Design an enzyme around this catalytic site. Structure first.
Site, PDB file in Angstrom:
ATOM      1  N   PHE D 227     -13.443 -71.730   9.025  1.00 54.49           N
ATOM      2  CA  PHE D 227     -12.245 -72.523   9.319  1.00 54.49           C
ATOM      3  C   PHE D 227     -11.666 -73.352   7.959  1.00 54.49           C
ATOM      4  O   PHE D 227     -10.946 -74.200   8.040  1.00 54.49           O
ATOM      5  CB  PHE D 227     -12.605 -73.637  10.312  1.00 54.49           C
ATOM      6  CG  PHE D 227     -13.327 -73.027  11.371  1.00 54.49           C
ATOM      7  CD1 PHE D 227     -14.615 -73.438  11.429  1.00 54.49           C
ATOM      8  CD2 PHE D 227     -12.636 -72.464  12.217  1.00 54.49           C
ATOM      9  CE1 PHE D 227     -15.570 -72.796  12.704  1.00 54.49           C
ATOM     10  CE2 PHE D 227     -13.356 -71.895  13.601  1.00 54.49           C
ATOM     11  CZ  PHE D 227     -14.887 -71.970  13.555  1.00 54.49           C
ATOM     12  N   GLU D 231     -13.622 -71.180   1.919  1.00 51.92           N
ATOM     13  CA  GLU D 231     -12.761 -70.804   1.155  1.00 51.92           C
ATOM     14  C   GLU D 231     -13.141 -71.197  -0.492  1.00 51.92           C
ATOM     15  O   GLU D 231     -13.137 -70.226  -1.049  1.00 51.92           O
ATOM     16  CB  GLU D 231     -11.153 -71.165   1.379  1.00 51.92           C
ATOM     17  CG  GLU D 231     -10.382 -70.789   0.537  1.00 51.92           C
ATOM     18  CD  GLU D 231      -8.900 -70.986   0.762  1.00 51.92           C
ATOM     19  OE1 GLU D 231      -7.895 -70.607   0.030  1.00 51.92           O
ATOM     20  OE2 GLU D 231      -8.476 -71.254   1.925  1.00 51.92           O
ATOM     21  N   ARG D 309       2.264 -76.100   1.504  1.00 53.75           N
ATOM     22  CA  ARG D 309       2.539 -75.630   2.893  1.00 53.75           C
ATOM     23  C   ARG D 309       2.924 -76.762   3.771  1.00 53.75           C
ATOM     24  O   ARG D 309       3.541 -76.493   4.847  1.00 53.75           O
ATOM     25  CB  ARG D 309       1.090 -75.079   3.603  1.00 53.75           C
ATOM     26  CG  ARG D 309       1.323 -74.532   5.047  1.00 53.75           C
ATOM     27  CD  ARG D 309       0.376 -73.533   5.674  1.00 53.75           C
ATOM     28  NE  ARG D 309       0.285 -72.407   4.822  1.00 53.75           N
ATOM     29  CZ  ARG D 309       0.788 -71.364   4.902  1.00 53.75           C
ATOM     30  NH1 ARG D 309       1.420 -71.132   5.929  1.00 53.75           N
ATOM     31  NH2 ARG D 309       0.559 -70.248   4.345  1.00 53.75           N
ATOM     32  N   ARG D 341      -8.196 -74.647   8.492  1.00 57.96           N
ATOM     33  CA  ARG D 341      -7.247 -73.965   9.491  1.00 57.96           C
ATOM     34  C   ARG D 341      -6.081 -74.667   9.720  1.00 57.96           C
ATOM     35  O   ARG D 341      -6.069 -75.382  10.512  1.00 57.96           O
ATOM     36  CB  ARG D 341      -8.191 -73.693  10.911  1.00 57.96           C
ATOM     37  CG  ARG D 341      -7.581 -72.503  11.663  1.00 57.96           C
ATOM     38  CD  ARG D 341      -8.505 -72.706  13.013  1.00 57.96           C
ATOM     39  NE  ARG D 341      -8.230 -71.308  13.721  1.00 57.96           N
ATOM     40  CZ  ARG D 341      -9.108 -70.939  14.847  1.00 57.96           C
ATOM     41  NH1 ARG D 341     -10.072 -71.631  15.149  1.00 57.96           N
ATOM     42  NH2 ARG D 341      -8.622 -69.919  15.549  1.00 57.96           N
ATOM     43  N   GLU D 690      -4.374 -69.276  12.178  1.00 58.42           N
ATOM     44  CA  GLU D 690      -4.169 -70.684  12.085  1.00 58.42           C
ATOM     45  C   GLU D 690      -2.916 -71.375  12.986  1.00 58.42           C
ATOM     46  O   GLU D 690      -2.817 -72.514  13.433  1.00 58.42           O
ATOM     47  CB  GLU D 690      -3.702 -71.182  10.413  1.00 58.42           C
ATOM     48  CG  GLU D 690      -4.852 -70.928   9.548  1.00 58.42           C
ATOM     49  CD  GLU D 690      -4.242 -70.812   8.113  1.00 58.42           C
ATOM     50  OE1 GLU D 690      -3.685 -69.935   7.710  1.00 58.42           O
ATOM     51  OE2 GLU D 690      -4.651 -72.005   7.323  1.00 58.42           O
TER      52      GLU D 690
HETATM   53  N1  LIG Z   1     -14.259 -67.630  14.994  1.00 57.39           N
HETATM   54  C1  LIG Z   1     -13.627 -68.209  13.969  1.00 57.39           C
HETATM   55  N2  LIG Z   1     -12.391 -68.043  14.059  1.00 57.39           N
HETATM   56  C2  LIG Z   1     -11.510 -68.528  12.937  1.00 57.39           C
HETATM   57  C3  LIG Z   1     -12.239 -69.013  11.942  1.00 57.39           C
HETATM   58  C4  LIG Z   1     -13.723 -69.056  11.989  1.00 57.39           C
HETATM   59  O1  LIG Z   1     -14.229 -69.668  11.038  1.00 57.39           O
HETATM   60  N3  LIG Z   1     -14.283 -68.678  12.928  1.00 57.39           N
HETATM   61  N4  LIG Z   1     -11.324 -69.529  10.599  1.00 57.39           N
HETATM   62  C5  LIG Z   1      -9.977 -69.735  11.038  1.00 57.39           C
HETATM   63  C6  LIG Z   1      -9.186 -69.306   9.707  1.00 57.39           C
HETATM   64  S1  LIG Z   1      -9.092 -71.014   8.957  1.00 57.39           S
HETATM   65  C7  LIG Z   1      -8.529 -68.354   9.231  1.00 57.39           C
HETATM   66  S2  LIG Z   1      -7.487 -68.596   7.887  1.00 57.39           S
HETATM   67  C8  LIG Z   1      -8.436 -67.128   9.964  1.00 57.39           C
HETATM   68  C9  LIG Z   1      -8.947 -66.310   8.999  1.00 57.39           C
HETATM   69  O2  LIG Z   1      -9.020 -64.892   9.311  1.00 57.39           O
HETATM   70  P1  LIG Z   1      -7.910 -63.780   9.559  1.00 57.39           P
HETATM   71  O3  LIG Z   1      -7.390 -63.978   8.167  1.00 57.39           O
HETATM   72  O4  LIG Z   1      -8.858 -62.384  10.057  1.00 57.39           O
HETATM   73  O5  LIG Z   1      -7.294 -64.549  10.784  1.00 57.39           O
HETATM   74  O6  LIG Z   1      -9.233 -67.277  11.134  1.00 57.39           O
HETATM   75  C10 LIG Z   1      -9.269 -68.427  11.846  1.00 57.39           C
HETATM   76  N5  LIG Z   1     -10.274 -68.154  12.989  1.00 57.39           N
HETATM   77  O1  LIG Z   2      -3.089 -70.936  -2.108  1.00 57.29           O
HETATM   78  C1  LIG Z   2      -3.181 -70.851  -0.994  1.00 57.29           C
HETATM   79  N1  LIG Z   2      -2.162 -70.618  -0.215  1.00 57.29           N
HETATM   80  C2  LIG Z   2      -2.096 -70.731   1.136  1.00 57.29           C
HETATM   81  O2  LIG Z   2      -1.138 -70.484   1.923  1.00 57.29           O
HETATM   82  C3  LIG Z   2      -3.707 -70.696   1.856  1.00 57.29           C
HETATM   83  N2  LIG Z   2      -3.955 -70.871   3.208  1.00 57.29           N
HETATM   84  C4  LIG Z   2      -5.438 -70.734   2.937  1.00 57.29           C
HETATM   85  N3  LIG Z   2      -5.788 -70.875   1.757  1.00 57.29           N
HETATM   86  C5  LIG Z   2      -4.750 -70.698   0.921  1.00 57.29           C
HETATM   87  N4  LIG Z   2      -4.474 -70.605  -0.380  1.00 57.29           N
HETATM   88  O1  MOM Z   3      -7.852 -72.820   6.330  1.00 51.39           O
HETATM   89 MO1  MOM Z   3      -8.240 -70.652   6.660  1.00 51.39          MO
HETATM   90  O2  MOM Z   3      -6.617 -70.459   5.264  1.00 51.39           O
HETATM   91  O3  MOM Z   3      -9.423 -70.490   5.449  1.00 51.39           O
END
Ligand SMILES: Nc1nc2c(c(=O)[nH]1)N[C@H]1C(S)=C(S)[C@@H](COP(=O)(O)O)O[C@H]1N2
Ligand SMILES: O=c1[nH]c(=O)c2nc[nH]c2[nH]1
Ligand code: MOM
Ligand SMILES: Cc1cc2nc3c(=O)[nH]c(=O)nc-3n(C[C@H](O)[C@H](O)[C@H](O)COP(=O)(O)OP(=O)(O)OC[C@H]3O[C@@H](n4cnc5c(N)ncnc54)[C@H](O)[C@@H]3O)c2cc1C
Ligand SMILES: Nc1nc2c(c(=O)[nH]1)N[C@H]1C(S)=C(S)[C@@H](COP(=O)(O)O)O[C@H]1N2
Ligand code: MOM
Ligand code: FES
Ligand code: FES
Ligand code: FES
Ligand code: FES
Lengths: 51, 162, 304, 753, 162, 101, 50
Positions: D227, D231, D309, D341, D690
């Site tokens: 979530f 990162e 953002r 997220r 997100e």
């Molecule tokens: N089950 C689950 N779903 C989740 C998350 C997670 O930790 N667990 N992270 C979220 C976040 S912050 C993002 S940016 C996207 C990242 O994966 P994707 O880029 O494949 O959607 O999934 C979302 N869904």
């Molecule tokens: O530099 C960034 N730009 C983004 O839009 C973003 N979303 C997750 N993490 C991020 N980092």
């Molecule tokens: O907050 Mo999801 O961009 O890792």
């Protein structure tokens, strides 16, 4: 560019110190087990039983 | 009874020594000093060469001799001091000249027999800091190398004579 | 089934098999920590850094595990799990008539949104009571209902209804250093006797500032005239308290508009918070005390 | 299988407990354990550190500090952090060092017993302190379109005020975790981390160790949640455990307890917002001025990109002719806040929906009428001058109104409120749009690596990490379609820095898009190379072609790559695309509040998301549901609370309440919008991760509706009053705003009413 | 004294029980059954859910109940039988229907909370083979999931009611 | 730089020779290059290290790999003739060019 | 050979070789008499094996 130049084996110093890791030197896991092959004592035979 | 010996200067107190434990097994598997190698287990290759030190109540002096670790019972080692390949130098601190010499001379190829040759030579130097070509060449009857054809090792170690 | 003993790095644990063993070990070692479900002690060792070098687990002792149905109410050994309490009490509610089950239903409300099947299956009753959390959801109930507590030590045996004196200072209860809580009898609701239990939905600091209450009124036979009135709160001090001044003032008063006005003026005065009380949430906290009572007031009127 | 509801590939292993997470990896015989030693002061000078009593603890190995580091003690995204604190600590969880011992337990005892001696320093904790002490990272970020004086002159009414929205903890069920294996040669090291960012784990370890990046291997099989909190912030554990491994020459590991994690790892940025809206009596917005302030904490990290953002999302789905949005990052003595997220969107979107709900009250019009009037049309430009193509919100909006039976249920509500006195109901319908792409253009890149082995089987590898979102599943679906072979023949093992280097973090919701694309290219190359053998043997099987290619010495391994075309917004000029496209959605929610306790039920939620053509409806519905309930958590339930001294009180499930089984709406309906292919992404699909979180706000405002109603009942008589309600709207905040004979002192004293 | 308990049917004889050891620690770290997860250590998340069985010298019957492993001292478990996720089924042999249900329903995303929800549900079924929708939903007040939004789990498990 | 190839090291100095080639092909110091190991997840379907041809064939594979990297970096090299390898490398990553082949 | 013996696709099996202490042809093929046996032991017991 070292091509054509007598550069020593890249791992020699680690081989010289015993830091170079070979297969058996890899640390064991807490639960790691050990196998020993059982092997024939006959050139040509029918296996009749194993005990 | 306790078994007490030393390894690369560190005290080792074995409370439950098994008489059947070879030094090689002990270093490799209890102590996790994996620089000493198993090559044969019958005293013929030298891959398992360590140096041993005991005080001899007789010569007065401390004596240093080499030994096959695949054949030495830990049980013979009470009050003996073991030195292994990791005890004399290291790319992390400083290579001992014996190590640096074998390296820079192309005396190591696959490198499995190197720790024991380093040890075989290191022992000679502990007993004779200025040995002759004769003594250097004979120091190695118990070490086999399948890789190098021996020439480069001897040449590299020759720089210790005169 | 014999007594067991385990020793580790810092702690000694004695698993007692007999109430005599227990009573003896506590005499020999008054410091010893009792442990049933560990759901409180566990927290204390891990997060609050307590070492209790000496632990007794009385979990095996019959007595301490017994469920008895006497003429006053239902007695539960101090080691019975909250889930047994809940199960025994659900059956009582469904079998006996409404008028005898006001307290039980109070207890069951606090028991609703409280932990999970995991916690309730191993958390003991006595454990909760003795822990004396200022925000214990059960002590306000036992207090308002005057739940009788049977407390034993080697030689001595007393029973006392739980009241405000039972929680003297933060985390302290009124047990002597050798005494253990043997059992707890939750009372049957009498004729003209009504009860309610409310709790703040949420919690924000470890063991402070979550309002929770048990409330009880007993009327003169067939009347709306108050004979006994008890309003107990957690979450308003460092311990379960009782609104003694407020409720005393209402004896033989009639259950109507005026009494509501007096009780709320009373509650705002007696349970008042300084604007730096631990926990914060001053204004919300006041409001729940009165709002909870208003619910009680309204619910009693319906029951009447 | 693309477009079919294929269960998550690991689900059954996850159901059985065979699925291996970081801490489940077996231990080596000599593996050691690390426990961080951490500040207990918001701002201080470290006077001394004493290990005396930790040394006495059985199994103690060593205490590590700044002095033990061989390379650099400078770390962080913007190099503004210490691996270990040196002279001064700058927040309560600030890492000072670490104890290493033979068991996690012995580690725990030893760490708890290190005395640090402190010297307290002046300390900036709140957004309010930061402003008044002028304490920020960087300068003011700004987007400005049109002309404000003239928006405000032309304006009928001008509402202004202030809003706060609290931060949030990730609460991934699995906390941060690293195993480091030091190899003994050349500074090599192999690491198993729960991280979304294996490239930054690699850099940081190497920078700290002083060794080239090529010596460091980072592997990530899966995470028990990310979530956003993994990162970047994962590296606070990784770098420490690496050092331990370097210093002792033994394998070392660490998993944080919950309380450590919530203290140390950072969470969502609280925002303060000061706003001014100008509108006609009609409800058409004419001007808008918003200054945003985020609580950054003690390092930059991702804060700057977060505020970007936020500034991109200050419009939601509203055409606003005259508009000025500024953003300021507060530099404060608190754990560095990081990605969560939504990454600043939620916060900006909530601010927006806040002044919008007030426009509609002030005009005494219904909210849906006002929202609709103000909505973007196909082809309008955003306040940042990007064209909106395939704007599918009206479809989402109508379809949501219809299946949610919004106009009928609104009748039921005002009905319920006339016949109910101490209980009230609310209903609200809210849109969202969310820009898809990292704000920083260089991160929009992605590699993949495919081998096809000679039995015909396939190993896919790509830059993306799996954290529950089903990335690997979707990738395996794409390969299988691209390649025209059964999914059963393909496999993904793990993500690793030795298969795909320089990968962007798995973040920004673009992983399916970018990695999908990379795998597709990879597949394509394999298809070209097999073409001849397919022609020579048209009736053969995949295995024959594969075998015949190997026999003929054609490579069965290839990389694949993708670059998102046409990106690059500019803050001077205010033009260029920030995003590749937008994901769109609408939610309607109904709550019932108890006016006497502030408690509430969520009765019903209806959701219609535009995901284009979902690669996996099951997974994507699953994303909407998950995102929404975390938003519902953010806005109604989750509350981090600190002491006046900056010390976090809320440090476990018992004082931090994330949504529970019974929290979710009783009636929880989700639909994907039909027949809306997206040209801009792999197989006409859309990012789903997100974008749905903010729809959770639908409960915030339904509750606000219910509060409005309770006030008209029991307090004053302004059909047109506005009270401030901050986020999260917890029981406390809800009760207090139900001003009644109880909250005033009754009694017939007097106050408010 | 010896500590004697069972795990997944197998006898465990602990000769040096430390009173401070939690069952979670014991499963994961002495026994190597890594299915049971640490999620908080304070009894709030349920990731550590196991089922315990003891004979109750009173009800006559053997009882089965669920428990938090992060709070359960092994020392309370003399003569108690633990069943973990790996004790009820496996993709190597056969999933228990509880496991297969949560899997095919999309009730598991990251998966870290799954083994404990499996256990929380499995326990209910042991005590009531045909439970109500009411009883199923309330069986999980002690499990948290951050991924799913809970709807799919409850729907998947509702097939056990009527 | 991380080089990986199908050949295994058994003392014959295969990795040494591969490192020398890469460093000459790429026109950078040997110190900047490394080979960790041989593995089936980096290079699949490899012939056994045998027949004396490993320097020949792996050398040639590493050469090709290197060339592709050199094409890729070419533009940034021209844009910055006086900059370092590290600048070209960084400038290419910033510009979203693959540094893997 | 490991995969064939285990009955599992090749993509499930990762082989890593850091270095050998000599080969000379004896480890071109014959290495697998050990490999395959150790793999089975790993399969049957679910523990690492050497
Ligand atoms: N089950 C689950 N779903 C989740 C998350 C997670 O930790 N667990 N992270 C979220 C976040 S912050 C993002 S940016 C996207 C990242 O994966 P994707 O880029 O494949 O959607 O999934 C979302 N869904
Ligand atoms: O530099 C960034 N730009 C983004 O839009 C973003 N979303 C997750 N993490 C991020 N980092
Ligand atoms: O907050 Mo999801 O961009 O890792
Ligand atoms: C996540 C979770 C949620 C919780 N939620 C709530 C809640 O909502 N409301 C609430 O009120 N509580 C709550 N609790 C607390 C729980 O109710 C108590 O922790 C529990 O009843 C303690 O019982 P135990 O068997 O675990 O006692 P232990 O932890 O084993 O010990 C309890 C205390 O009492 C002493 N003690 C135990 N038995 C006796 C005895 N017979 N005689 C004298 N002293 C004794 C012990 O020495 C110790 O001080 C929660 C706990 C957790 C784990
Ligand atoms: N030191 C050493 N040299 C060696 C070997 C070895 O194992 N150790 N193997 C030999 C054999 S049998 C062959 S076929 C070649 C293979 O490696 P190359 O192709 O790099 O020469 O190394 C030869 N030289
Ligand atoms: O027999 Mo040498 O070709 O490995
Ligand atoms: S191993 Fe060959 S001599 Fe000891
Ligand atoms: S180097 Fe291979 S044996 Fe001497
Ligand atoms: S770990 Fe959260 S309850 Fe056991
Ligand atoms: S699926 Fe990740 S916590 Fe439940």
């Amino acid at each position: 560019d070292t091509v054509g130049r007598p550069l020593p084996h890249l791992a020699a110093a680690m081989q010289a110190s015993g830091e170079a890791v070979y297969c058996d030197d890899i640390p064991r896991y807490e639960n790691e087990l050990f196998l020993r092959l059982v092997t024939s004592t006959r050139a040509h035979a029918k296996i009749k039983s194993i005990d | 009874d306790e078994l007490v010996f030393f390894v690369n200067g560190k005290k080792v107190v074995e409370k439950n020594a098994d008489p059947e434990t070879t030094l090689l097994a002990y270093l490799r598997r209890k102590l996790g000093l994996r620089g000493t190698k198993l090559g044969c287990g019958e005293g013929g290759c030298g891959a398992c060469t360590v140096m041993l030190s005991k005080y001899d109540r007789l010569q007065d002096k401390i004596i240093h001799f080499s030994a096959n670790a695949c054949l030495a019972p830990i049980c013979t080692l009470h009050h003996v001091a073991v030195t292994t390949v990791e005890g004399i130098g290291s790319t992390k601190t400083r290579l001992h000249p014996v190590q640096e010499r074998i390296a820079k001379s192309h005396g190591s190829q696959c490198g499995f027999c190197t720790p024991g040759i380093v040890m075989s030579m290191y022992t000679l130097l502990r007993n004779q800091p200025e040995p002759t070509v004769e003594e250097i060449e004979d120091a190695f009857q118990g070490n086999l190398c399948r890789c190098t054809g021996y020439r480069p090792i001897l040449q590299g170690f020759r720089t210790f004579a005169k | 089934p014999k007594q067991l003993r385990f020793e580790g790095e810092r702690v000694t644990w004695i698993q007692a098999s007999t109430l005599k063993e227990l009573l003896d070990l506590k005499a020999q070692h008054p410091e010893a920590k009792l442990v049933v479900g560990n759901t409180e002690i566990g927290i204390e060792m891990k997060f609050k850094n307590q070492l209790f070098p000496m632990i007794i687990c009385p979990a095996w002792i019959p007595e301490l595990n017994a469920v008895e149905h006497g003429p006053e109410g239902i007695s539960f050994g101090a080691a019975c799990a909250l889930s047994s309490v809940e199960k025994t009490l659900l059956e009582a509610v469904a079998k006996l008539p409404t008028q005898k089950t006001e307290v039980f239903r109070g207890v069951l409300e606090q028991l609703r949104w409280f932990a999970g099947k995991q916690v309730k299956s191993v958390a003991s009753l006595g454990g909760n009571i003795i822990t004396a959390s200022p925000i214990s959801d059960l002590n306000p109930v036992f207090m308002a209902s005057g739940t009788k507590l049977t407390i034993v030590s080697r030689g001595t045996r007393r029973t006392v209804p739980m009241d405000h004196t039972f929680f003297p200072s933060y985390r302290k209860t009124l047990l002597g250093p050798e005494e253990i809580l043997l059992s707890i009898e939750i009372p049957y609701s009498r004729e003209d006797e009504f009860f309610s239990a409310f709790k703040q939905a949420s919690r924000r600091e470890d063991d402070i500032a979550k309002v929770t209450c048990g409330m009880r009124v007993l009327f003169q036979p067939g009347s709306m005239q108050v004979k006994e009135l008890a309003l107990c709160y957690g979450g308003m001090a460092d311990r379960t308290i009782s609104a003694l001044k407020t409720t005393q003032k209402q004896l033989s008063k009639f259950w109507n508009e005026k009494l509501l006005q007096d009780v709320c003026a009373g509650l705002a005065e007696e349970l008042s918070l300084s604007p730096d009380a631990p926990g914060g949430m001053i204004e919300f906290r006041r409001t729940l005390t009165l709002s909870f009572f208003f619910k009680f007031y309204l619910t009693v009127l319906k029951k009447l | 299988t693309v477009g079919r509801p294929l269960p998550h590939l690991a689900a059954a292993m996850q159901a059985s407990g065979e699925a291996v997470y970081c801490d489940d990896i077996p231990r080596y015989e000599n593996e050691l354990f690390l426990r961080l030693v951490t500040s207990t002061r918001a701002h201080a000078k470290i006077k001394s550190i004493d290990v005396s009593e930790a040394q006495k603890v059985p199994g103690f190995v060593c205490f590590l500090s700044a002095d033990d580091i061989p390379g650099s003690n400078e770390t962080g995204l913007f190099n503004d952090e210490t691996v270990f604190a040196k002279d001064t600590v700058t927040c309560v969880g600030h890492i000072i060092g670490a104890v290493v011992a033979d068991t996690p337990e012995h580690a725990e005892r030893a760490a708890h017993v290190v005395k640090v001696t402190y010297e307290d320093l002046p300390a900036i904790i709140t957004i309010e302190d930061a402003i008044k002490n002028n304490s920020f990272y960087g300068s003011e970020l700004k987007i400005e379109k049109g002309d404000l004086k003239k928006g405000f002159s032309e304006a009928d009414n001008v509402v202004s005020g202030e809003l706060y929205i609290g931060g949030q903890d990730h609460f991934y069920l699995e906390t941060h975790c690293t195993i480091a294996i030091p190899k003994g040669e050349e500074g090599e090291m192999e690491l198993f981390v729960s991280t979304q960012n294996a490239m930054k784990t690699q850099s940081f370890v190497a920078k700290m160790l002083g060794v080239p990046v090529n010596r460091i291997l980072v592997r990530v099989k899966r995470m028990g949640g990310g979530f956003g909190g993994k990162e970047t912030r994962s590296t606070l554990v990784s770098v420490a455990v690496a050092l331990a491994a370097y210093k002792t020459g033994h394998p070392v590991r660490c998993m944080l307890d919950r309380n450590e994690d919530m203290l140390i790892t950072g969470g969502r940025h609280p925002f303060l917002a000061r706003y001014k809206v100008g509108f006609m009596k009609t409800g058409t917005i004419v001007a808008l001025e918003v200054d945003h302030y985020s609580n950054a904490g003690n390092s930059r990290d991702l804060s700057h990109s977060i505020m970007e953002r936020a500034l991109f999302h200050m419009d939601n789905c509203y055409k606003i002719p005259n508009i000025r949005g500024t953003g300021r990052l507060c530099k404060t003595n608190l754990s560095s806040n990081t990605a969560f997220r939504g990454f600043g969107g939620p916060q900006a979107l909530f601010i927006a929906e806040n002044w919008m709900s007030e426009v509609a009250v002030t005009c005494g019009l219904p909210a849906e009428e006002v929202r609709w009037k103000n909505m973007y049309k196909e082809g309008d430009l955003t306040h940042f001058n990007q064209r909106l193509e395939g704007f599918s919100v009206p479809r989402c909006w109508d379809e949501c109104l219809k299946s949610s039976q919004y106009y009928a249920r609104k009748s039921e509500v005002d009905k319920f409120n006339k016949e109910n006195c101490w209980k009230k109901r609310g209903l609200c319908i809210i849109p969202t749009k969310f820009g898809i792409s990292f704000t920083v253009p260089f991160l929009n890149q992605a590699g993949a690596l495919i081998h096809v082995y000679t039995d015909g089987s396939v190993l896919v590898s790509h830059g993306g990490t799996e954290m529950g979102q089903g990335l690997h599943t979707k990738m395996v679906q794409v390969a299988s379609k691209a390649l025209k072979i059964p999914i059963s023949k393909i496999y993904i093992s793990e993500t690793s820095t030795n298969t795909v280097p320089n990968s962007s973090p798995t973040a920004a919701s673009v992983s399916t898009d970018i990695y999908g694309q990379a795998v597709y290219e990879a597949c394509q190359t394999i298809l070209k190379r097999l073409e001849p053998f397919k022609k020579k043997n048209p009736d053969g099987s995949w295995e024959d072609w594969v075998m015949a290619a190997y026999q003929d010495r054609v490579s069965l391994s290839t990389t694949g790559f993708y670059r998102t075309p046409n990106l690059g917004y500019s803050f001077e000029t205010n033009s260029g695309n920030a995003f590749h496209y937008f994901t769109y959605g609408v939610a309607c929610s109904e709550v019932e509040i108890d006016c006497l306790t502030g408690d509430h039920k969520n009765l019903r939620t209806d959701i219609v998301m535009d995901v284009g053509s979902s690669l996996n409806p099951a997974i994507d519905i699953g994303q909407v549901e998950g995102a929404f309930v975390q938003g519902l958590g953010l806005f109604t339930l989750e509350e981090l609370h600190y002491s006046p001294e900056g010390s976090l009180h809320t440090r476990g499930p018992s004082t931090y309440k994330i949504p529970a089984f019974g929290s979710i709406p009783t009636e929880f309906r989700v639909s994907l919008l039909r027949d809306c292919p997206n040209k801009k992404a792999i197989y006409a699909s859309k990012a789903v991760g997100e974008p749905p979180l903010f729809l959770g706000a639908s409960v915030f405002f339904a509750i606000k509706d219910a509060i409005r109603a309770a006030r008209a009942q029991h307090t004053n008589n302004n059909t047109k009053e506005l009270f401030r309600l901050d986020s999260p709207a917890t029981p406390e905040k809800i009760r207090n705003a139900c001003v009644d004979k109880f909250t005033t002192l009754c009694v017939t004293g007097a106050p408010g009413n």
